[PDB]
């Protein structure tokens, strides 16, 4: 079977304002993103989205879909299920909340079918208990019979999906088993059936979490099928800032998610006549809500990044810019330089505005 293209939106919600926070969606999304890229998917991965941002992202996803295109949605975070409809809960959901604060997966499915996709895959890594406060009874149009729909639910209706408390960089339970099967060259239904059996050996979750598979896929389609973001993943180029005093500072940028970028700085040149100099970043747009106590750390790990010292240049200072989708205007920040001349006593301070526009998903 052939795909016209293969596109995936992955969303991982953790930083809930009014509900228990989660931890593993970060690692689950990161790792599924890379696995899907190995299978030649165009992937948008996003963390910590509000209701408005989740709908925007689905709208963007749906734009990428067309006839014959494989579309895959993965969601890791709080969810629930009422009356056969699954809902994804955004990080700004009130408590209590209801269906109007959430995205109904069946609505997304209907919209994808209208693009005449060749395959629709939903992997829902979320709880599926009822929401007693949500007594809306909205019957959607009967979906068309396109015989190309596959759901892999991390858990069964009325049950919870889990991740391991206090477990560092461990996956949630679903991704823990999915990750070791995703690359198999097998019909997606068969692949998921295998994951279900792997999970049936997980002692921790037996009797509480089991995969549910729902499928009407009547062709042997797989995530590996041959294909026969553009403005969504633009990264500013590395730049070399030369200050008046001769010091030069390298500024580099790394994508961690489509809405999380790491900036890092290092001294690449210090004139002989200057004895000491430090460079740091500051004055980021208020929208990104960067806390300066969290910036200019000696290690990526200290910024709360999934990235470790070995995936990035060494001996820099790193700053994590999450929530890039909130960036309304241009990403303008300041590179400050402190230095001192041999023979002098005064610490001199220079600064320089830098403007890299709207990176990654901020680009809209």
């Amino acid at each position: 079977m052939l795909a016209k293209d293969k596109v995936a939106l992955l969303i991982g919600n953790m930083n809930y304002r009014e509900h228990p926070k989660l931890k593993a969606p970060l690692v689950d999304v990161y790792e599924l993103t890379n696995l899907l890229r190995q299978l030649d998917f165009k992937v948008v991965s996003l963390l910590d989205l509000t209701e408005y941002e989740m709908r925007n992202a689905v709208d963007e996803f749906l734009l990428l879909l067309d006839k014959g295109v494989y579309g895959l949605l993965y969601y890791a975070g709080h969810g629930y299920e009422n009356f056969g409809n699954s809902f994804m809960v955004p990080v700004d959901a009130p408590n209590p909340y209801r269906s109007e604060n959430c995205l109904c997966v069946q609505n997304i499915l209907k919209l994808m079918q209208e693009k005449e996709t060749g395959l629709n895959v939903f992997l829902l890594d979320m709880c599926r208990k009822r929401n007693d406060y949500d007594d809306t009874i909205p019957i959607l149009d009967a979906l068309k019979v396109t015989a190309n729909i596959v759901f892999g639910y991390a858990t069964c209706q009325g049950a919870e999906a889990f991740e391991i408390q206090h477990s560092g960089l461990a996956n949630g339970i679903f991704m823990k088993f999915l990750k070791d099967r995703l690359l198999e060259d097998k019909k997606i239904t068969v692949l998921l059936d295998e994951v279900a059996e792997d999970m049936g050996k997980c002692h921790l979750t037996k009797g509480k979490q089991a995969l549910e598979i729902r499928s009407s896929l009547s062709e042997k389609r797989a995530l590996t099928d041959p294909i026969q973001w553009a403005k969504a993943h633009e990264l500013p180029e590395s730049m070399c800032l030369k200050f008046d005093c001769g010091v030069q500072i390298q500024l580099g940028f790394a994508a961690e998610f489509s809405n999380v970028m790491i900036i890092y700085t290092s001294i690449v040149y210090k004139p002989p006549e200057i004895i000491m100099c430090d460079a740091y970043v500051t004055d980021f747009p208020l929208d990104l809500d960067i806390d300066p106590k969290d910036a200019n750390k000696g290690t990526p790990e200290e910024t709360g990044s999934y990235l470790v010292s070995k995936d990035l240049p060494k001996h820099c200072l790193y700053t994590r810019l999450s929530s890039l989708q909130k960036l309304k205007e241009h990403l303008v920040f300041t590179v400050c330089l402190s230095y001192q001349y041999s023979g002098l006593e005064d610490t001199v301070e220079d600064k320089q505005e830098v403007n890299v526009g709207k990176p990654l998903i901020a680009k809209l």
Binding site: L22, A76, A154, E160, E163, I164
Partner: peptide, 4 residues
């Protein structure tokens, strides 16, 4: 040990 932690539900979603």
């Amino acid at each position: 040990v932690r539900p979603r």
